[PDB]
Amino acid sequence: GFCWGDLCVPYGTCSQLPPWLQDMCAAASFD
DSSP, rough: EEEETTEOOTOOOOTTSHHHHHHHHHHHHOO
């Protein structure tokens, strides 16, 4: 879960994102 201040990328944004952004969203899910 990558956090930019208070903006943490939701773990469940992956299907709303396209493949290349899902790659990071994978680490968003696990971090």
